[PDB]
Design a protein around this ligand. Structure first.
Ligand SMILES: [Mg+2]
Length: 261
């Protein structure tokens, strides 16, 4: 039976349309917590921009975090796994973005920066997603940092253009205007493995929830993968179960369906 739940944040816990967590989601997680489920976040966001979970956090319902697509995982104050991108690939991404005139976020363990922020950053990260303004640094300075995750604001076509110069990184998307780049093997699936290693939970006792392409590996890897009703067809196909849309009680309905609650 299920012992560990892994939730994406954006489009899974937090609605893109309302920018809030459905009330029935909070009730479902309260009920699961009392039944002894372990409840984990599995997000592309770095901790520095997880500003949308206070309802769950103030209720003390989260048992651990997979952040930066698995590249930075922690339980309480304890880091259980982290990674960093090969410096050649950091430098190549910075050069590509600067040449193409697109912005890129560079995330370190304890700092976050953006290079040449433009309309794509404003529109998406701040005015929509409600992320706090990220400090600006030069591409030169960024290219020399120990970087855990980079978030270039590149199209799929530009992604294929720069791919030969990031030959070992993972690349995922949770939103169409940008991608998250992490080191070899660092996807949310890795995050699941690290969390369950810490807790003595078996993979066969896991359930994951997601809406986006960067959730596909954890939807396939968890024993039971649940796709949100509004997800694209490839995300739904990676899941075992497709629930209702997020704002039609999708999380709660899925949890009830499986008898989690
Ligand atoms: Mg998502």
């Amino acid at each position: 039976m299920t012992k560990a739940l892994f939730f994406d944040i954006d489009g899974t816990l937090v609605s893109f349309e309302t920018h809030r967590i459905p009330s029935s989601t909070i009730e479902a997680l309260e009920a699961a917590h009392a039944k002894g489920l372990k409840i984990f976040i599995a997000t592309g966001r770095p901790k520095a921009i997880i500003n949308n979970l206070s309802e769950l956090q103030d209720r003390n319902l989260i048992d651990g975090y997979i952040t930066m697509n698995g590249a930075y995982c922690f339980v309480g104050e304890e880091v259980i796994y982290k990674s960093a991108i090969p410096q050649e690939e950091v430098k190549a991404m910075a050069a590509f973005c600067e040449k193409k005139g697109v912005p890129c976020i560079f995330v370190e363990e304890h700092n976050i920066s953006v290079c040449q922020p433009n309309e794509m950053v404003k529109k998406i990260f701040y005015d929509f997603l409600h992320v706090n303004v990220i400090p600006t640094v030069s591409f030169e300075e960024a290219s020399n940092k120990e970087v855990i995750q980079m978030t270039p604001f590149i199209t799929e076509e530009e992604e294929k253009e720069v791919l030969p110069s990031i030959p070992t990184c993972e690349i995922g998307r949770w939103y169409p205007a940008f991608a998250d780049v992490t080191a070899k093997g660092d996807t949310k699936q890795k995050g699941i493995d690290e969390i369950i290693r810490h807790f003595g939970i078996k993979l066969e006792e896991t359930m994951s929830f997601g809406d986006g392409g960067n959730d596909i590996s954890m939807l396939r890897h968890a024993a039971i993968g649940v796709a949100m009703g509004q997800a694209k067809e490839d995300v739904k196909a990676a899941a075992d179960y497709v629930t209702a849309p997020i704002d039609e009680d999708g999380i709660s309905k899925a949890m009830k369906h499986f008898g989690i609650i």
